């Protein structure tokens, strides 16, 4: 440790994308592409959010720019999403594409439909947000995703995202 | 907000250094620069780290490199270094350096000075953490410093870092 912290990769075979997902959601953050929100949204504070994989909402900001969340609106209800972390890959199904106001923070808690639970969640979800419409920021589009999939790596890459290869996760 | 987060600026006027510091401590994170550990260390888990300026302990993470923390022995106590905000310039003034085994994670605690603490915080450290010896991770050289003056930047960039011009913090 001093760090022991990891970092993600996404894959979306849909639009044929992949990113290293950084920590936070900050400008410099996500300058280059997407970034994680440290903390999920309750009615009594932020708390940590999910790591990749696990029970919670893991969401991702990332700019709605070209190599980036521009082609997020072509996600449908079905489509996967993959999140690597350093032992597993984790798919995802897309359950909901929306369109809120800024300040939907509901769509950050841990449990994004039931956001005014306390309790600890016990579902994993991924959720993508962007700016929207396109070349506006007066909304977000939100795709939220649910873990259908945990699979080792240690079994090799899933087939559906085989050919998205690093140029060059853990210190 | 969604996201809301925002980053900070360092400064190091002994070594004449400054960067962005961005959020998170993985790979990917400090691959170019520092970065903000998300959450401190407490006997209790994790919790929420301070952010710029506020009590507990903002820590940071930075490679044994040239262009980042290579030169992090050669600050003293009493050397400043200033950490900047949307609102503020916030001088943190050294008050211990030292040598740790990778595995000593209560530097990054609440209070590093009492890192057994289950209470809430009241002093604002700075904490640096970089891999020590020169070219080793055997170790980790630990710089803590201390809050001694916040400047809300209506009053103007102190003269110590007026010099450290941005090539180009909020979304
Ligand atoms: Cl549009
Ligand atoms: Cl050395
Ligand atoms: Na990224
Ligand atoms: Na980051
Ligand atoms: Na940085």
Redesign the interface.
């Known amino acids: ?7 993600s990769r996404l894959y979306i075979p849909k639009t044929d994308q992949n990113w ?11 300058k280059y592409g997407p ?5 999920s949204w309750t009615p009594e504070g ?1 708390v ?1 959010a999910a790591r990749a994989g696990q029970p919670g909402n893991y969401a991702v ?1 990332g700019h709605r720019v070209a190599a980036v969340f521009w082609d997020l609106d072509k996600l449908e209800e079905g489509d996967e999403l993959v999140l690597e972390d350093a032992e597993n890959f984790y798919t995802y199904q897309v359950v909901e594409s929306k369109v ?1 106001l ?4 509901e ?2 808690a841990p449990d994004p439909f039931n956001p005014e639970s306390t309790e600890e969640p016990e579902k994993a979800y991924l959720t993508l ?1 962007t700016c929207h419409p396109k070349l506006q920021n007066s909304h ?1 589009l939100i795709v939220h995703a649910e873990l259908v999939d945990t699979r080792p790596k240690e079994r090799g890459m899933p087939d559906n995202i085989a050919h998205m290869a690093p140029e060059n ?3």
């Open positions: 440790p001093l760090p022991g912290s990891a970092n290293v997902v950084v920590s936070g959601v900050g400008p410099e953050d996500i970034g994680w929100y440290p903390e932020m940590p900001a809120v800024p300040n939907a923070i769509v950050i947000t977000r996760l853990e210190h």
